[PDB]
Assembly symmetry: D5
Homo-oligomer: 203 residues x 10
């Protein structure tokens, strides 16, 4: 006889490639940790110290609301969460199918979930291009230092100053590089899994 | 002989359907995580930057206390916590009953807790309609931008400005869509479990 | 032969009743989670926006130090932590005794720690009445809206305004109801365990 | 045949006494949790609301930098983290030695790491007296309410007010009592282990 | 027959030395915990209480943006996260290779991953010297107390005061000592593993 | 022989009636003295303490410039000066003609300038009705206490408060009564001089 | 022959008694000069430095408008100007009658205007009692130091401070004494002129 | 015999024409009195209420100094004083010559100072055209309402508001009309004196 | 025959000595003119710019009221007015007696009012010593620069600064010297008039 | 017979030259009038609008007290008053001597006070050079625009701005020119009187 906690691990550590195993480590310690630990402190006083040259109440609220409809900390969070989602559905499906197969019963006999891996890789790859295009079209590459605001109740043209315009642009480049490097890790894995699956098919 | 840590998972991963396994994954990574990580920073300076057009001390406190008796961040937290509660009582009951059955002893012999799943699904479904109706009757769909306040000690009619009226209304739509999508996942599982239980009953 | 990771669970899931397993689930998802996630944001600007009608430096500090000697957020935290303490000593004792009994060796033979459960239930029950009485005698049921302060260096009688006097009183009722409901869960379990232990004793 | 996940627990739950098992439970839920959850909110506006009687820029920074060179929140953190360190080295050593002994192979045969427990107890005991003496010589027992400051660029003698001088002194007593109670738990365990080891040694 | 949850630990607990096991304990409880728990509160009001001697709006933002282009809290976080990265790739590689070796099958037969440990140690050692040199060339050893700023729109020379210049310099020394002590732990392990590998090679 | 300083006085003290002599005394000690000594102090802080409910620079100047285009202190001065002008031309003409008549030479022989007195009385009488009508149509009878102002750059409707609205209205009544009483003094003199001149004309 | 510039002086210097000549000197250098030179500077910042304990605009105006409806500087000026008026009508009547009597012609022959002096003295005496009674009933004897104000838009009871409450009360006593001393100078002259006129009348 | 206080008046009231006697009366009661009594109160807070849109000290001083180098109240004073000067030298010369002629002694014999009157009229006429041209080239006809200021230390372009821009422009027209009317009074007198002097010269 | 306007001047310019004629010229152009023209501008902002180190309303009023109960500008005015009073009573008495003596009639016959001059000189001399002693005992010789104030509602000891402490002390010396010089002018005249009157008295 | 009011003028208008009569006219209408009417308004806010770059109370008073120990308005007043003093003593002496000479009695017989005119001219000339030298050594020719101040309690070097630095320097030039022109009028009169007196002296 054999146990079952073990068999539940060989099945999971036989359908994930080494590249996909290292992608999971790289894009959760350098991507999901920097956003939480180093992103929140930087973007805490974005409105508190967004200083405008006015004294009329309500002008600084309207000017900041026009300046940044949606912050890019929230955009980073949503983009990073929605990429880890295809990797959880497949993990839950593998555990649901593998543990429901040993209950009935019959040099192991690990099932082959290789067709369900290429689809998840394709969806994950397609989910990064759209979020990269939206990121480029929404925020650009570097943060500005000044903002002209003319909305009421402000009279004339008011000038407002952005807080921390340099460090915020230094974190943008780091996150852009991390995302670009992680995008090619799923492209070097798909073109290998596809090339391997057809090879192991005599006919 | 066989172990019983594998038996304690096969029992649990035989009473939960694939739809129910997928609902658990979706409504904790896109619902319970966005509320904590992305909801708290947005609603931090709701009173600090709630600027009113007055100079008399105590008017800004009174006006804000009438503007928002209960914030919708707390409402989101309470609504999301009370939906995961029926899913924990059933999980604890399954573990209490399963491990108390192998102690006495006698191609497995997994117990069938299918009657205790429909009831938990019904309670969970009924707990969402009430919280949706209350949400619609309390906060609406979009956030306002201005507030007229006439309570004492303010003299006349004072105007106050809401902080971040646009991003707050963008997060409401995302959470509304997530809740609406999760409500139909428990409705597509109940009408399948009920239809399956009667099928597997010759008489 | 049999394992011991399994034997270490039946020993633990044979000395805890269903009511005691359900109390553990309820009073950490609705009590220890609301305090941490929904209590900290509410009580963050209690002194920052405790506005008094004065201009002399140091009057607002003195007045606030007399208004609230100890906050009830810390009271809630200490009261909730000290109730989970009797449940941890018993858990650690059960694991210490159970794993030291299978080392020597000889239809299982699970030990009976039923006498050590009633004592922990009694201590837990006695620890709630004292904290309820202290809570009633210290903070009451609802939060006030204004405070008169006459301490030096303030001249005359100064009036100060409490921040968020309505939502703070709405959370008080929720926590009071949760505590009252959890107090009767340990009373319906003790009067059942005591009545069962004497029944299973012919003589 | 037998497993070795259980064998890795008998070894660990045979070298730690009951007093040492309950010390870990007590001085982690009442010491490391109150510091994190109840200490951070109290000491968040120590400088923001350290109000001095001056209008010259830079005087309030200089006065506060002389009032508190190092805060006692960080002192509590460092003192509590350096006491849990001897308990982790011994735990890692026990697992390193135990799992390297069953690989070679030969009513169990649990190894006896009793000599490596008294040394860790002695180091832990010696690490508390020094931190208690430093705590007494640095911060005293109660928090003050006022501070006289004469450093430049302030002219004359300025008076500054401490924020929350009462609650801060109420938390000090609780933490002092917790530390004093935990110090005698390691003294009642050492004088028992030493007395037991010599007893089980005929010669 | 034998399990494989046990075989998955000896494989991991036979390729890591005692020095490497104690290094992991040391520079994660005294390095990654002090940065998070004790570093964030200190560096929270670095810009809020960076007081400059001016009244023109926008001067305090410009002066602070030149004072600190990048904070050293973020530098500490990035430096500490990039050193734990080589230790995770090796860990995941060991688990990927070990569990893929028992599936095929044939006094244990644990594989020897001793060659893949020296390279990871070398990379980890090389990653510390660069970050130490950059730390020296960027921030120095102690924090200043004043800053002269002449950038527009400020007129003349303005003087600004740094918040908490003493405690910030006390945490610098603690972290410098921790890093210096951890650097020699990987140097005492490499020159031992290298000297041992050649010894166990007759030819 | 006789002198001519004396003859220069009988000529002047024979063409002015008793009513016209008392009018000069009354409307120079109660009219031209109250305006200078009691009017200037009252109207000194009319703009300095004209408080509006706004904080935007330039709104208080614009609102005051529309509230009072021309002050009534200046109106009182101009009206009181232009009434004393007809009385000076006649006085200078009498002295020019009288001293140019005794140079050539021949119970005195005082010349009769009775025709040149009725014309000056008529002009003086006609100069009061126009200034009374203008005063009634411009300022009214009493001073207001509040002013609504909506001119730019003020946003919305602003309320401004008039300084000393009661005493300013108490001086208005005194000056109105003085002017009304002085107007009938020139009407009781003209209808007497006209009735006397025709009587002393047999033919 | 004789001149008439001289005859115009004996006529005036034979109808005014020594007491009446001295009264004009006294209550014109110590009464009409102290009011102008020493009264205006004291009452210049009566409203500018009338400090009230409020921040709402418009409260300090309405409070001062109720504190002092009419100032006593204006009252002093009006009272002092209305007493010198009876002394000017008699003076101009004497010159009008005297210069119109020498034109027609016949040890001088100065006319006797003794009957027209008693009536002017009586009117002057009667004009002082009324203004003394009004002064007593309006302003009292000493100036206050504080004022309670409850008029809207002020909230609650506000306390305001009077500027220069001591010097203003020192000038009041000086002016009261001057007026009281001047009142008895016209009473010692009337009871002498009346007693002399009847004496020089044999029949 | 005759006196000479009279002879000193016939001499003076025989060399001044009726037009010249009337000009003297008009341009000191409507010109020299309005400037002093009505011009000083208007131009008292020209700098106090010259509000600029800036917060940097020293900008409001330089902006006002550039706005008005020399005020037109001082210009009015100097222009009006320098026109009365030619009328005083001639008056002093007539008195010096007339009283030095009767000392030596011989139907009066009044001297003829007609040649010294045309020259003074010519100088007075020439002194008005230059001051009118300078007034036109310096201040214009109406007062502005706003001023743009860019001098250092002000940053950018600042806008400042003029106090009382309407009443100040109403006084300008009154003074311009008075000056224009007085200029033609000296032109209607010169062309008459010149035409009369040549007529009374047979040869 | 002779006139009596001249006779009214011989009488007055025969009872006043040359020293008494020059005293009137000196102590009216250098004493009564400097006080009015140069004293009022200096003492105009004595309270407006009496800056105290406090922020509580009402403290600066009571502190200034205690500082200067009576100003020395008013003291100078009252002291200088009360010295010119004895010189006016004698002047009015001389004109009253001289014009009443020529009416009755009989190398002139000027009356001798020499006994009424020594008495007025004695009273004037006695009126200066008292005012000098009071001036010395009240204000001293030089003005202070700082004032400590502890009256309520001020808390502690407040420091206030006097405006223009140097120029005010420069005017004090000038006025002291003028008064001291004028005091000896009336002493050099009395000891000469007394010595002359007894000489012109044979018996 | 002759009068004496006429004799009192020829005596006075025979000892004053035409140049001396013209100097009197010029240096009271262009010197004593511009100082009073045009000098007081300019120097009214010299301290109110003397803006320094500081916030510490008491620094602006100390800095202004060192900037201008004595103002030049008071210097102008004192210098102009002390020059008219020699012209009043001579005038009073001429009237004292002339009216005391006709009382005793004997083509007039006017006395010759020519020796007492040169002495007064010499004293007046000598009183101008000293005040010109002091004026040059004290204030210079033009007014500054900025002032550096380092006196305590000001910290560092403070910059202060002078109010109206341009118009104040324009009035200085006008007054300098007036004084310089008036100084040569007394020099062209003395060198003529001295040359004439010696001519009219045969021996």
């Amino acid at each position: 006889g054999v146990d079952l906690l073990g068999f539940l691990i060989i099945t999971l550590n036989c359908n994930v490639t080494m590249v996909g195993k290292l992608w999971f480590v790289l894009t959760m310690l350098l991507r999901m940790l920097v956003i939480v630990l180093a992103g929140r402190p930087v973007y805490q006083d974005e409105q508190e110290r967004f200083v405008c040259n006015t004294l009329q109440p309500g002008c600084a609220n309207v000017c900041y609301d026009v300046f940044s409809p949606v912050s890019h900390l929230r955009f980073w969070l949503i983009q990073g969460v929605c990429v880890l989602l295809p990797s959880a559905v497949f993990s839950v499906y593998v555990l649901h199918r593998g543990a429901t197969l040993a209950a009935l019963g019959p040099g192991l006999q690990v099932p082959d979930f290789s067709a369900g891996y290429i689809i998840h890789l394709l969806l994950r790859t397609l989910l990064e291009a759209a979020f990269g295009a939206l990121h480029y079209f929404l925020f650009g590459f570097l943060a500005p230092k000044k903002f002209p605001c003319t909305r009421p109740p402000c009279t004339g043209v008011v000038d407002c100053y952005v807080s921390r315009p340099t460090e915020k642009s230094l974190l943008m480049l780091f996150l852009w590089a991390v995302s670009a490097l992680s995008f090619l890790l799923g492209l070097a894995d798909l073109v290998c899994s596809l090339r391997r699956r057809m090879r192991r098919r005599p006919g």
